[PDB]
Design a protein around this ligand. Structure first.
Ligand SMILES: Nc1ncnc2c1ncn2[C@@H]1O[C@H](CSCC[C@H](N)C(=O)O)[C@@H](O)[C@H]1O
Ligand SMILES: NS(=O)(=O)c1ccc2c(c1)CNCC2
Length: 261
């Protein structure tokens, strides 16, 4: 019944808590922001993660996780359980009033990538390759998609801070991973980012209870679901980034392959 708590989820508060200074201050190279974008950028740059269709699971109200991705997939589908979030994304996609400002992130993605691209072009490219924002539920064996417009099976998947924040225990976690994995073409690639050893995090009046997982638990989970773990890294949270919006201990990044056998 996490969903019950997620009913009170405030997008603007979530964004403010996790993507605005200090955590949203990309100037310092030792912060999470740089780190996250760096993991994402290096991965796609290897050129091994490519295709036509890609799906972002539990996008929430954020778009940074697709910044380096849009360069490699022409059809991008973003998703999220809450309508509030799908709407918050819409504001940015259609450049509506009050949309969130992702400039710092677009810019840094451009710096790390090194193609001399300007942030305006990357944002316009991402906006262009995002075809639709679909509701989803990782708890359903068929992720809230009876007959979804989304091209299946997607060529790749990306998920940031979703699974561990929507499942109450390690098993819900494991099963949810199984659910989304079905959406992925064999030989496909998964890019997973999430909290390490986190039990709660706020979001306005919403106070989410979550499953504290370790790098090892994540690895085992990926393996159980049939992935070869291509790359798995962890960022330990510095004291200055440890605010009162949660109790994260670190952030992990995983690059996995749906092993076709
Ligand atoms: N059953 C479910 N299946 C999938 N997503 C769910 C869900 N219940 C809640 N969510 C979504 O879980 C997300 C957790 S926060 C996710 C973080 C976001 N991807 C980022 O990178 O910042 C929210 O957008 C929330 O609405
Ligand atoms: N500081 S951060 O940008 O790396 C980040 C992003 C999302 C979430 C957390 C932390 C922790 N709680 C889940 C949401």
């Amino acid at each position: 019944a996490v969903a019950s708590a997620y009913q009170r989820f405030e997008p603007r508060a979530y964004l403010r808590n996790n993507y605005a200074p200090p955590r949203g201050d990309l100037c310092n190279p030792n912060g999470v922001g740089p780190w996250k974008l760096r993991c994402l950028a290096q991965t796609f740059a290897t050129g091994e993660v490519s295709g036509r269709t890609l799906i972002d699971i539990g996008s929430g109200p954020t778009v940074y996780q697709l910044l380096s991705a849009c360069s490699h997939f022409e059809d991008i589908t973003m998703t999220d359980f809450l309508e509030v979030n799908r709407q918050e994304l819409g504001r940015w996609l259609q450049e509506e009033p009050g949309a969130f400002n992702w400039s710092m992130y677009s810019q840094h993605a451009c710096l790390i990538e090194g193609k001399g691209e300007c942030w305006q072009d990357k944002e316009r490219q991402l906006r262009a390759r995002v075809k639709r924002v679909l509701p989803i539920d990782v708890h359903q064996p068929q992720p809230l998609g009876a007959g979804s417009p989304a091209p299946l099976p997607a060529d790749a998947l990306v998920s940031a801070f979703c699974l561990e924040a929507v499942s109450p225990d390690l098993a819900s976690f494991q099963r949810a991973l199984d659910h989304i994995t079905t959406l992925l073409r064999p030989g496909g690639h998964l890019l997973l980012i999430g909290a390490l050893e986190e039990s709660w995090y706020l979001a306005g009046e919403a106070r989410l209870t979550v499953v504290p997982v370790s790098e090892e638990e994540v690895r085992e989970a990926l393996v159980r679901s049939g992935y070869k773990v291509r790359d798995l890294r962890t960022y330990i949270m510095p004291a200055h980034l440890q605010t009162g919006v949660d109790d994260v201990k670190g952030v992990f990044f995983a690059w996995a392959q749906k092993v076709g056998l």
